[PDB]
Design a protein around this nucleic acid. Structure first.
Ligand SMILES: [K+]
Ligand SMILES: [K+]
Ligand SMILES: [K+]
Ligand SMILES: [K+]
Ligand SMILES: [Mg+2]
Ligand SMILES: [Mg+2]
Ligand SMILES: [Mg+2]
Ligand SMILES: [Mg+2]
Ligand SMILES: [Mg+2]
Ligand SMILES: [Mg+2]
Ligand SMILES: [Mg+2]
Ligand SMILES: [Mg+2]
Ligand SMILES: [Mg+2]
Ligand SMILES: [Mg+2]
Ligand SMILES: [Mg+2]
Ligand SMILES: [Mg+2]
Ligand SMILES: [Mg+2]
Ligand SMILES: [Mg+2]
Ligand SMILES: [Mg+2]
Ligand SMILES: [Mg+2]
Ligand SMILES: [Mg+2]
Ligand SMILES: [Mg+2]
Ligand SMILES: [Mg+2]
Ligand SMILES: [Mg+2]
Ligand SMILES: [Mg+2]
Ligand SMILES: [Zn+2]
Lengths: 219, 115, 305, 59, 110, 154
RNA sequence: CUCGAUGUUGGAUCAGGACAUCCCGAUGGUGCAGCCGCUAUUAAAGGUUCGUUUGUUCAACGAUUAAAGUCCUACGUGAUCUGAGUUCAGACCGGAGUAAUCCAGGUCGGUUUCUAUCUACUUUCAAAUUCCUCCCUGUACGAAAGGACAAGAGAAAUAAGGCCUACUUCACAAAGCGCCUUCCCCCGUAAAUGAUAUCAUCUCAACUUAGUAUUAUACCCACACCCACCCAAGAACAGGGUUUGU
């Protein structure tokens, strides 16, 4: 039972009525535009209306490297290498300009963020603009790809080896040395994983959100 | 995005660009009052020891939603009259330039890919 | 002489009983004021040029994106009207000003945590106390009897409004954050001077001019945003979707009034006057108004052509 | 009838009342006519204040 | 920066004896209904707290005497029994701490 | 500008704060009643409640065992936490600790409070108790309540 | 006036003021056809850029802009900062001197203290300036080349005041690289009727008009619940909530 990440409010001091109304608008838009299920790593083709374009319709295919934002305005970033030039486009889920969203391939990676594909080799970010949609059998677990990419020589856009990012899909043993690994193992915070008060429940909130979604489906 | 001392990459098939040189192309003027150049703006480049005008067709800085973000500061060499130096732009460029096509019609004509 | 609070001497049995009593009384008082036109209404004059009506006190719930039919994204702020009532009317002569004034209350608060004078003032009107009371300058023809409730339908889409609120206080702040001073370089020998004001005046005057920018309290004052467009009205939860941001943090009371800008002048002819009366209205308004150019969620995907 | 005072000559246009708000650029000078229009009881009050002794009893 | 002139005793008195610097009168002082000593409304009575602390210290000393070593925390509950008291059905299966005194009136055997 | 900063700055750093809270929590788990400065004794109350929640989750849970091993410096208290502390509050869904302010410390005049786990074997602390129902105001309110109930049932 | 000490060149930050105005504003003349200009009156509310070598103030150069204004303020501002220069003790080169030593000479290096007693000040609460694009219009004008003004619409930059829905620094929140809003004028002259002076005359004649704002309006405004707890409120104090006081 998949709940979209934008359907979980961030911890704060906001009146739940605003979240309720935003969710109502989100569902009333979802009934018109079928937003599918996808994760960070799934291949998506997005077809959108656009002025000043060939046929006023623009289609972009790419891998989802980041999903961020809650409520109306949630965004996902698609990256693809076209003619040797990497292009990343940020698409809003509930923008009326979006005409169709299609999951060409549904899968998951070892990390919740794939921003290191910018510094990775172009082979791991190159995808065919015209690829046949794969078949995902119903009532099946989402596959978890374990492709550990190879990175370009340093420097990188961000210090991916530091524990704060906590990346498990990069060949650090190949792209780094023992001394570099030891130096990176200096910002580690072992107490962070054991700080109990820095945890968000999401259980009751998710249950109430599912109840409201079921009510919207009924009506 | 693109400002003074910014090393840009020339993407059209011009003779002045796409040529070996010890130095790299570099912006020296952005022709904008705020001093920051975006997609669809004219800049001045010191390329091969010469001063030339260029149009910004892509930058690495994130911008508005539903817009492409490239991995390099891609520019196309043009002239004062508004005509490009090259005759082919294989690198994809944003479709947002079709609003400026009133002054970049020839550039968009020589362009081939629109992302 | 000893400090006292309402539940200091109450026992375990009487602690919930008083709370239940006061809650029921407040609910009854709020419900009893739902028929202003059925309970001795004041005369309802038609709109005339150069007439000003009353405003609202709202709660800033948050912000939300919106998309228009021209393919543009605008951020709006949701202002919720909560227990807004007219409390006091002052005539032009007694106003000690230029025009008559009307008092509007905001969020309901506990009677225990208030002064005796405020409680005895609200007892006569028969309403629960309001957290904030604001004063609106209105013309004589827009007089409204005290006790009349107010709702978000008072404002209609296609109208520009002004929003006044207390901004997010930031405390004692330095010059660089408070006024935007460039400061001093962080290298090249600078000694204990990176965020300091520098020179405050000249040596000839021998003093500092009044109004000189110096570090001090910042962020907690009344600020007004002028000319925010009302994109959408939700009459079920009494919510106004106002264009742009408004001063103040989340869950704060703000004053919403008609815009005073000369461009948006004399545009209240089609607006309700003096205010919207749901009890007197026979054709109930739809749940959401959505203006004209707003892309409704149920509308089909926009196709530029 | 302080509003109906009469000035000899062209004092309504020549006589200037000056003040300073204390802030930079806050030096304001107005004519007698402008001051009279802004406040019809200001000219007589200022004249009496100027003619009274410069001590603590003047207030 | 050095002072320009010595500050006078009049100015010193005006600064020192300002009402802000004067000690304010506390109106939260009340009388403990049990021990009769003074207490604040939001603070526990010092007399009763010290009594409870002394009794707790004695009980903890007895607990440590029974344990007889570090890193020895019993897996069962604990019940404190005073003189002339027998283990109860609830006390069954729980470590018994024997106190050589009469049970205090305030220490109600709940 | 500290707005929405739930956690305060104590100790030599974040790790020092974590270690101080861990020591206080271990002492609380051991003795079931400890007195400490008000801020320090208030910061780890939520940590103690969540530790009891993990104990309820159980010793067979790997995450709960890891959390107990971390937060309990003395390893003899982990069996205690998983065997007696959690079943004691099994019925309760929360509120396992009582914190009460005490007179200020003698030396530094610091704001002190005592925290304890409910249901301990130690002698009960004096507690703030409301006035008896037999007082004048309470009797008047009881009469008013009886009259209102009669009116409602009429 | 100060040698019983009044710290300087240039630079950073902050700017105050004068107009003898660089632009934007309003007028007269022209050797003013239009576009560019020149000159004179009025206007100081707003603004007047980034780099290369030089310690530079300045000058030279490359690219823009409407503009890259002149000065005063202890050659403003070192109890806010810098020390490249000048101006100590070391040393070298050229010259003068028998030598010690010296130079408007050149060149490398060379400690920049202070815990604020007093005066003054610490939200002058909110009307904004400019460029560009389309149209006007290839119109007025002009032999052609060339080529407007006024009005309207739009989009930007700077400045001020706010905010976190999206992006980003990051995550109970603070921020910009992000988003929203921003409303009056400014007086030189140009003209009717009309006397002294029965014409005529814009008037320190009486008088009408361009021609003016009592700068309009907005904001702030109830107060012995306050022991205690919480807070988007805060150095303390103060403020808001507790109908969330096991
Ligand atoms: K001297
Ligand atoms: K001297
Ligand atoms: K003095
Ligand atoms: K004449
Ligand atoms: Mg980077
Ligand atoms: Mg050369
Ligand atoms: Mg604050
Ligand atoms: Mg800086
Ligand atoms: Mg030093
Ligand atoms: Mg330093
Ligand atoms: Mg400390
Ligand atoms: Mg002296
Ligand atoms: Mg200035
Ligand atoms: Mg002049
Ligand atoms: Mg000087
Ligand atoms: Mg110094
Ligand atoms: Mg000085
Ligand atoms: Mg030096
Ligand atoms: Mg020599
Ligand atoms: Mg030197
Ligand atoms: Mg050296
Ligand atoms: Mg100091
Ligand atoms: Mg024009
Ligand atoms: Mg005539
Ligand atoms: Mg005549
Ligand atoms: Zn006692």
């Amino acid at each position: 039972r998949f709940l979209s990440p934008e359907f979980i409010p961030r911890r704060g001091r906001t009146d739940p009525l605003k979240f309720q109304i935003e969710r109502k608008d989100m569902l009333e838009r979802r009934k018109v535009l079928h937003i599918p299920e996808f994760y960070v790593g799934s291949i998506l083709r997005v077809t959108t209306a656009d002025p000043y374009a060939s046929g006023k319709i623009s289609q972009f295919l790419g891998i989802c490297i980041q999903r961020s934002g809650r409520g109306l305005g949630a965004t996902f970033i698609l990256r693809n290498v076209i003619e040797g030039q990497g292009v990343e486009i940020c698409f809003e889920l509930y923008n009326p300009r979006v005409q169709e969203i299609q999951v060409v391939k549904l899968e998951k990676r070892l990390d919740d963020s794939l921003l290191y594909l910018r510094d990775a080799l172009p082979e791991y970010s190159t995808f065919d603009v015209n690829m046949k949609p794969v078949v995902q059998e119903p009532n099946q677990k989402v596959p978890v790809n374990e492709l550990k990419v190879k990175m370009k020589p340093k420097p990188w856009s961000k210090r991916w080896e530091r524990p704060n990012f906590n990346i498990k899909g990069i060949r650090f043993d190949l792209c780094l040395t023992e001394q570099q690994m030891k130096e990176a193992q200096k910002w580690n915070q072992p107490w962070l994983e054991f700080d109990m008060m820095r945890e968000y429940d999401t259980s009751k909130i998710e249950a109430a959100i599912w109840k409201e979604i079921e009510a919207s489906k009924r009506s | 995005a693109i400002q003074k001392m910014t090393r840009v990459r020339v993407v059209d098939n011009s003779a002045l660009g796409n040529s070996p040189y010890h130095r790299a192309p570099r912006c020296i003027h952005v022709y904008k009052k705020n001093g920051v150049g975006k997609v669809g703006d004219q800049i001045l480049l010191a390329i091969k020891g010469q001063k030339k005008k260029a149009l910004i067709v892509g930058h690495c800085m994130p911008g508005p939603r539903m817009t492409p973000r490239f991995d390099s500061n891609n520019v196309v060499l043009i002239e004062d009259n508004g005509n490009p130096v090259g005759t082919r732009i294989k690198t994809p460029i944003p479709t947002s330039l079709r609003k400026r096509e009133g002054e970049y019609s020839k550039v968009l004509a020589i362009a081939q890919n629109f992302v | 002489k000893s400090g006292t609070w309402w539940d200091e001497h109450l026992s375990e049995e009487n602690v919930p009983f008083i709370k239940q009593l006061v809650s029921d009384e407040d609910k009854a008082q709020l419900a009893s004021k739902l028929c202003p036109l059925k309970d001795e209404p004041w005369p309802i004059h038609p709109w005339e040029p150069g007439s000003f009506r009353v405003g609202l006190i709202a709660l800033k719930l948050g912000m939300m994106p919106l998309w228009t039919k021209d393919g543009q994204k605008h951020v709006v702020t949701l202002l919720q009207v909560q227990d807004c009532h007219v409390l006091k009317y002052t005539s032009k002569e007694n106003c000690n000003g230029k025009m008559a004034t009307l008092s509007v209350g905001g969020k309901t608060v506990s009677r225990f945590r208030k002064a005796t004078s405020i409680l005895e003032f609200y007892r006569e009107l028969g309403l629960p106390p309001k957290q904030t009371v604001k004063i609106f300058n209105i013309t004589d023809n827009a007089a409204i009897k005290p006790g009349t409730p107010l709702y978000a339908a008072h404002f209609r889409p296609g109208q520009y409004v002004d929003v006044t609120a207390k901004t997010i206080g930031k405390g004692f702040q330095g010059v660089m954050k408070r006024w935007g001073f460039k400061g001093q370089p962080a290298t090249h020998g600078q000694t204990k001077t990176h965020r300091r004001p520098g020179a405050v005046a000249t040596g000839d005057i021998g003093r500092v001019w009044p109004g000189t920018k110096m570090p001090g309290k910042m962020g907690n004052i009344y600020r007004t945003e002028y000319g925010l467009k009302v994109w959408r009205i939700n009459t079920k939860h009494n919510i106004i979707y106002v264009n742009g941001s408004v001063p103040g943090h989340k869950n704060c009371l703000v004053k919403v009034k008609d815009s005073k800008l000369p461009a948006y002048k004399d545009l209240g002819k089609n607006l309700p006057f003096p205010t919207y009366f749901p009890d007197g209205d026979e054709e109930e308004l739809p749940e959401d108004l959505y203006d004209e150019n707003v892309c409704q969620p149920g509308a089909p995907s926009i196709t530029f052509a | 009838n302080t509003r109906h005072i009469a000035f000899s000559g062209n004092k309504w246009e020549q006589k200037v009342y000056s003040s300073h708000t204390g802030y930079p650029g806050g030096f304001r000078q107005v004519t007698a006519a402008q001051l009279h229009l802004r406040d019809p009881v200001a000219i007589v009050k200022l004249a009496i204040y100027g003619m009274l002794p410069k001590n603590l009893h003047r207030r | 920066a050095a002072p320009k002139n010595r500050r006078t005793i009049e100015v010193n008195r005006c600064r020192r004896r300002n009402p802000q610097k004067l000690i304010k009168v506390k109106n939260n002082i009340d009388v403990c209904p049990e021990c009769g000593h003074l207490k604040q409304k939001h603070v526990l009575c010092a007399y009763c707290y010290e009594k409870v602390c002394k009794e707790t210290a004695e009980i903890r000393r007895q607990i440590g005497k029974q344990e007889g070593g570090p890193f020895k925390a019993p897996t069962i509950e604990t019940v404190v029994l005073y003189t002339g008291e027998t283990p109860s059905e609830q006390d069954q299966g729980k470590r018994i701490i024997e106190r050589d005194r009469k049970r205090p009136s305030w220490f109600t055997q709940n | 500008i500290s707005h929405g900063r739930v956690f305060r700055r104590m100790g030599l750093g974040p790790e020092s704060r974590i270690h101080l809270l861990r020591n206080l929590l271990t002492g609380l788990v051991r003795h079931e009643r400890i007195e400490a400065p008000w801020a320090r004794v208030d910061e780890m109350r939520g940590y103690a409640e969540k530790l009891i929640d993990y104990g309820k989750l159980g010793d067979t849970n790997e995450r709960a065992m890891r959390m107990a091993d971390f937060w309990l410096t003395e390893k003899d208290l982990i069996p205690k936490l998983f065997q007696v502390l959690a079943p004691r509050y099994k019925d309760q869904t929360g509120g396992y600790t009582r914190m009460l302010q005490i007179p200020n410390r003698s030396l530094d005049r610091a704001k002190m409070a005592v925290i304890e786990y409910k249901g301990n074997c130690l002698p009960p602390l004096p507690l703030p108790r409301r006035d008896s129902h037999l007082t004048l105001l309470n009797q008047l309110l009881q009469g008013l309540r009886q009259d209102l109930r009669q009116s409602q049932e009429a």
